[PDB]
Amino acid sequence: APVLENRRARHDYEILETYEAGIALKGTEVKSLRAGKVDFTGSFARFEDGELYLENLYIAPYEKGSYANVDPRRKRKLLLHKHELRRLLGKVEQKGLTLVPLKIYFNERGYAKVLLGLARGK
RNA sequence: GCGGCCCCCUGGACGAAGACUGACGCUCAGGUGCGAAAGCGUGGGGAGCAAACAGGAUUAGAUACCCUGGUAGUCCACGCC
RNA sequence: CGGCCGCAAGGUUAAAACUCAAAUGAAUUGACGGGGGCCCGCACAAGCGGUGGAGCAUGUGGUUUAAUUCGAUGCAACGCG
RNA sequence: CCAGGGCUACACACGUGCUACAAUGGCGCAUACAAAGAGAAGCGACCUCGCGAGAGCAAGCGGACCUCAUAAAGUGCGUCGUAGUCCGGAUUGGAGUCUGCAACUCGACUCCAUGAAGUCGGAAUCGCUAGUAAUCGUGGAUCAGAAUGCCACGGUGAAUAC
């Protein structure tokens, strides 16, 4: 099932805007993704420096016929242009915004992309 | 628990008078009998309604409330519970 | 559990360990209800003129920025300090 | 502490206001009737000058005296003739004016030219029950200057209530 939304978020925060951002995966992570027993329970995105790294995303190393992978909950970066990135950061702190993982999947050109959005309303 | 009208059979209550029996009364473990609805058995019946079931919706879900359909059952006899 | 009753569903009879510092009855004051009743106020009506469209003045969110200083944010912030 | 800059940014969104979309109007002419308020590092007459904003001179008045001040709607004539118009004035060009050390960023005003959108406004929504609303001017405070804001003042003056 390549393509899922975030059933943890609807009833917890509320989206304002929604951006799409390619992720810095490794390959095994991609495999685990092409599968589907990973969860956003607790995962959101954060800017450690000036760059945004979605964190707490757990991606079960591999299942069906798994094998040697890497740190299930690893700080994975996010891609987004300088302009498209200097924004959401300044609107985070507005008074209380949060970068929460909305949906995940691979695009036309076969690239796993993540969908984030501002959060409030809990 | 019992509602159309009619007849047949039948239990209790109540009143007016007087007469008769003369305490023959109260209660009652055990015992016996009755005991709604649902349910069961053997059959009958079967329009309405209706568990179940079928399907339509509603909903986040909706094995529900709503809607369309509908079996048992509701009715009869007898016997049970 | 045992007994007894029933074709069954089950009924009847009827405990103990264990556990809790309660359980319960009638009566509390409010607040609140997508509860009910009674009843008020330019809260809805009858009217007259507007805003919402336009250009502009001005404020704010936003966006941008080297900085766009801080504050004020339903009514009761936004020609507000 | 000081200079320069920003708070005035501008794809957009909203709030509150202003000005219109006009003959119950515009424009010229002439003529009518207020209130309230301010003033010395202030109001500043007259006179002259410039189209004008304004400037040169200069009385008066600490002020029922003097200045700010020549209310506007209105009334009378006159024209327009229902058009994106003589409606409407945004915008932009040029040339100027008073403030102030300093008007690029950003002041206000002036004169000449330019003459957007707008032909009365969806869902909706705000006001007001009387001298109110509507609509016309006037003044004050801040303030060197910078009022469509705010705070006042009177003129005209309705509709409507089961």
Added chain:
RNA sequence: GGGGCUGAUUCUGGAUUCGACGGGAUUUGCGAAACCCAAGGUGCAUGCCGAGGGGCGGUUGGCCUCGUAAAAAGCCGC
């Protein structure tokens, strides 16, 4: 022991994971590590020379200073 599937969702395509952070290349004006020279300022000046210093230590051979023999700087840690 043989058969199929699997190494990124576009079946021969053209580097669009737009993406960051990181790396490479080009340009530019500011800092001297962007840079070079010495006019530009000044007179005993110059350089190399040689030698020594804060409760303590280390580094700029350095920051300081002295001149035919002896006194004081900047950063970090305790």
Added chain:
RNA sequence: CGCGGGGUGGAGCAGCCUGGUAGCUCGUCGGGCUCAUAACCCGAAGGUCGUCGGUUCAAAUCCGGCCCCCGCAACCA
């Protein structure tokens, strides 16, 4: 082979005999409605009407002709 019938937004389907509009939705975007949210409610991005040739004042549409799908009946040295 032949009789049909069919392709039109990112998928869905009307406009197909009538010529004269490129739309009806789902879904994103705003803007409406609330005291706010929901729910209804609107306006837009977006399609060579498959293709090309064509008559008309004008074509998705009537004509053409072919690529292409699907139904059938039939063909296969």
Added chain:
RNA sequence: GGGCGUUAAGUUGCAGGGUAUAGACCCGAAACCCGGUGAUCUAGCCAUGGGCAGGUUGAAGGUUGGGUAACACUAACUGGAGGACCGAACCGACUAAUGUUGAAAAAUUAGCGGAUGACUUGUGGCUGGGGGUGAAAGGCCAAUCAAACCGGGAGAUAGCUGGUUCUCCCCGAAAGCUAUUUAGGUAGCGCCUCGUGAAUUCAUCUCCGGGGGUAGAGCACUGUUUCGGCAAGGGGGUCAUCCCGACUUACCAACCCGAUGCAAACUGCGAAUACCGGAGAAUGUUAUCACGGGAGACACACGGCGGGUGCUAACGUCCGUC
């Protein structure tokens, strides 16, 4: 020019050799089709007769008592039910032993199930072969049945197996290729035989004219493997910035050349053999070629040499050659 023809006598008997059509050299299937004969065994059904010693159990019902307000209830007795119980005849056939050229083509012996039933049995009837009947096993239909028996088509067909008879003499194979619903069959070629005809036709050797890419070798092309280094650059660690120094490091990154070995999809080389051609003598019963009559053969085996395959395993397997 080319193809086919003209430049060779045919014909009819007779004997023989082949082929064709026929049973076509003889014997042999399992089967297929046609017509009849069979239900005296067996399967089912129909009509009509028969059989079931002896013992058990004791259903429905009924009677009289008891008991009750009356029913309930109960008790004796009576009754005589049943794919009911034990057990002979009868019917079956579960186990074992014997028997197995039997006493017997399914039995004997000891045990075994049923035994008033969907029981069993006599006589007769009816159902017929792709048909019957079947409490279903493909069972039974006359010692049999996934299609009876008998006669016929009939000498079915048999690319299979077997067999094939008197004598002497001459020659003398093949177990290969090509095709094949072919693979143990067959066809054409090759090889045997007979005949006619034709050149020194053919073989061996000698001298002459040839092309080889094999054995071996080599590593230029090319390829692989191993070792060494290049100034430089570079990398790593070490004193820790940094000596932009030194050392060891082993480390590889950018195109470096050198040496050695090997060569199935390779050669900058290259034999022996073998083969093709010319010419020539000798020898050889034409050994050669063409035509024609008769074929057989197309399962090969081992051994040597050169190899693929396998284990340089096999009395393995697949080619070449003797």
Added chain:
RNA sequence: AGCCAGGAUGUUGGCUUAGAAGCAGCCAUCAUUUAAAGAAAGCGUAAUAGCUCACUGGUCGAGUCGGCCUGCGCGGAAGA
């Protein structure tokens, strides 16, 4: 080759040495006196060890040592 002899000095050798004084260990393998004696040959002590060695004297008195090329043989060699 026997035999009779010697087999040492720094040095009990410094040493991550509990004890080493040759020895799994320590490192190097240098260094004194002699005829010549190894910071090491050994079976190997609680350690000093006792006892033989590689290496040197005497004795004896002529041969001795073991690589290469080749012949024939030997072990390696167990089945019903």
Added chain:
RNA sequence: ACACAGGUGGUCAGGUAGAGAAUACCAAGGCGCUUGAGAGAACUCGGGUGAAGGAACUAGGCAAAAUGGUGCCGUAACUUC
């Protein structure tokens, strides 16, 4: 196919014991079954008895051995009674 241990419906039914048409012995009746004689080995068939043990046999208690009648007493789970 045999002078074949097999198959073949009906009828008759004595005595003693016995429930009996079972079984045993007999009656009436009918039979010794068409090669005999000796021997007294293995082995085979069919039988009898067996110390101690008692399923150790075996695929398996196969085959044997065992129980065996009439009356009265007594008789568990379970049960469709």
Added chain:
RNA sequence: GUUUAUUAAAAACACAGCACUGUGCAAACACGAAAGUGGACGUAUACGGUGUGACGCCUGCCCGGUGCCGGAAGGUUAAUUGAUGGGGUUAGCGCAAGCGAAGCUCUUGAUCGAAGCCCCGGUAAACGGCGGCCGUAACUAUAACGGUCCUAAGGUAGCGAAAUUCCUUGUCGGGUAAGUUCCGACCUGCACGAAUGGCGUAAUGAUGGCCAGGCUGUCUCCACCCGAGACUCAGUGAAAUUGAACUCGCUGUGAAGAUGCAGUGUACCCGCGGCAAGACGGAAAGACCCCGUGAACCUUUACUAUAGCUUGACACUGAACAUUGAGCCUUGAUGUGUAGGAUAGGUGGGAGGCUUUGAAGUGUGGACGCCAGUCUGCAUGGAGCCGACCUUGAAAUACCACCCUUUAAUGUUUGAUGUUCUAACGUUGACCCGUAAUCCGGGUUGCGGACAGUGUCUGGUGGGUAGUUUGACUGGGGCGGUCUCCUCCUAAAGAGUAACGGAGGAGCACGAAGGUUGGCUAAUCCUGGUCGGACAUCAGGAGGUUAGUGCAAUGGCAUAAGCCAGCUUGACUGCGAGCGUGACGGCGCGAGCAGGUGCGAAAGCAGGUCAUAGUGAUCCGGUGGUUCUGAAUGGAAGGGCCAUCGCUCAACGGAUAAAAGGUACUCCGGGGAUAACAGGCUGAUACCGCCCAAGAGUUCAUAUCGACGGCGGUGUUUGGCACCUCGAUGUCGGCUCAUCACAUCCUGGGGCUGAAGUAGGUCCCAAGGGUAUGGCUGUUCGCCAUUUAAAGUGGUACGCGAGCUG
């Protein structure tokens, strides 16, 4: 209860009960070409079919597939009908090229046309299916839960190591000394599960498994005894078999397991009773296995037909009427693209027809219709309206013509739908006569009634029935793979050359990627310089064909065969000396000759492409051309000739146009040409031993071990091969009875030990003798119990069935 007569009596069949379904009676259904008959002298409480199988509790989820039951707007569709078009003939006409009337004829195939199938809905006590992936719960684990795959749905209860469980003797518990079985549990159900029924169940059972008492010759372990044989005598008197025998053991050899061969050992001649190791002993032309273009039954969405059922047309086959669809005929309405006097069809005639044969313009009726407007009879009336008009791409309700739109109506044609009747036809209602008759016939009547039914034609359905097909190679067969073509290696220096040997490719492409004339010349590296890199283009040098060649590989290619331009069609027609290569069918190469061409000044080159793949015989037709033929003659059809088209006939020499399976119910001909057992050969594998000696062993390689590697022995395992046996060599285990080897389990002798003793380890010598009972399982074996000095390893057809067992 039934059943395999004659190896199976059972858990199979039957059963009462249950359910689904069909059947209205001339019933369905069955035997019958039919008549008839059964069903039944019955009548839905009846009768057939099918599944399930007392009773109890129950019987969940899925309708996509396949059946069946319905519906139906659409799509396609049979006989039939026979519209068009095209052809043959020839009266005539053209002097002639050709045309061609009527007729007759060949073809074409519109329109009509029912079921079917597609389609839509039901349906599971119809035939069936009841799965994957993922995610999710406090630690694990699982997953109540949620996604998903679209394949219709994903297992409810109950049960579960089972008559189902592969691993498996699962694990735990119980029973036993010990239990592969058993019982009770767990759930990890390879692969239970709800009328192909699930789970239970008292009774019953010559039913399967387990336990125990009693019993015992079943056994330790056999003894004695009575009887029938066996043995002797007498009489009678068989059998299968058999090339001939003067018919020994060993070891070897050998068509591979020897009485017969070699070598050798041993043995005087002949009976009798006994035993079964050999005579691959007898019996049956192996039943397994493979082969044959064998047979037969059986199956099915194999092929092809066919009875049955079903659809339509026509025939037997009626009289009256009504309504209505579709043509076709007149007639009369009918046209709101935009400027504009306005709900303009198109062309064409077309400057007056029309009106007193009574006009506008007022007034209604019927009327259509985007209620925009229009037409009309009636009528008042009472005497007119129109034309380029200037605009419109196109001008007149001025009107008239042949017409399309759409429309309406009488009519003609053709369909269908309905109603009323009767005479064919039916009657398996009634009554009458033949006739004392249940048949049949005729008659009368009632009931149906042109239906039903039957013939002919036709579409569908049709394992109910029938005939057949279902390849071959193969290191047996099957499974997989392969089948034609091309390149290379094997291939042994000419050609050719095999394998289920090692590697790759083809089933095309191109009107230029062909022809010619002229011209040009790659890769790779260095150096520089834009992005720009190890390689993008550019310069120079090196290099020198490594590049390139449409594509696999080999051979070629510079004179280029590589690359670019101009002109062009030689990608040409007829032929072809001569040669290659093939059994053949065929295939290839070819100078040159004639015609005509393109390029070139010209010599000259060109009959496709650097070459080698890129293919499909014949038959049967189709299309164009040629009078070659033409069944009396002239034509014509048809045939021939030349060009051409249609096969993944790919199993590629191509059995048919058309074809899959099962057999354990089987059968025949054959084969040891070819598998299973055993033998043989082999020895990779296995087992046994050795060589090296790092290391383990406190120190120390070799007491005991030993890495990495090396050499062997045996014949003994797993295999390879297919030599013997398929006109038969019986397979595992047990029993009984053995016999040999020694690589020795015990006992004996011994060396080393990391050997104190006791007890061990290891090696050497040794084959004399000895070398366990039991639980479980068919087991060999193994595990478990318990003994013993020990419980040896192997060979002997994995010894031993003419000895036993099964």
Added chain:
RNA sequence: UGCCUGGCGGCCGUAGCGCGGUGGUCCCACCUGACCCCAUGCCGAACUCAGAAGUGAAACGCCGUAGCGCCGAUGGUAGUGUGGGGUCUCCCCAUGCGAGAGUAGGGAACUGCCAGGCA
């Protein structure tokens, strides 16, 4: 006849490459000019036309030189036809044939027709 050079060939590395030196009267080359013939997939480079100021620089030719290429014995070795033999996966003997590589060494081409120039 000599020396030189251009053309066309034979031969096809003992002929080639490198490196040194060298030649311009003639020849050859570079070279000058280019509207024009003809030309560039751009370019007068090449192709071409008109020429002759310059130069032997490049190219070319000739001479020299053994750094590379090349040629390359003798002897041996390898293999192999026939015969024979072993300890037979591989060899040996007799006989014939006999490499490849390397060694010595060779080697800076040799040659015919025509033309031109100089002596």
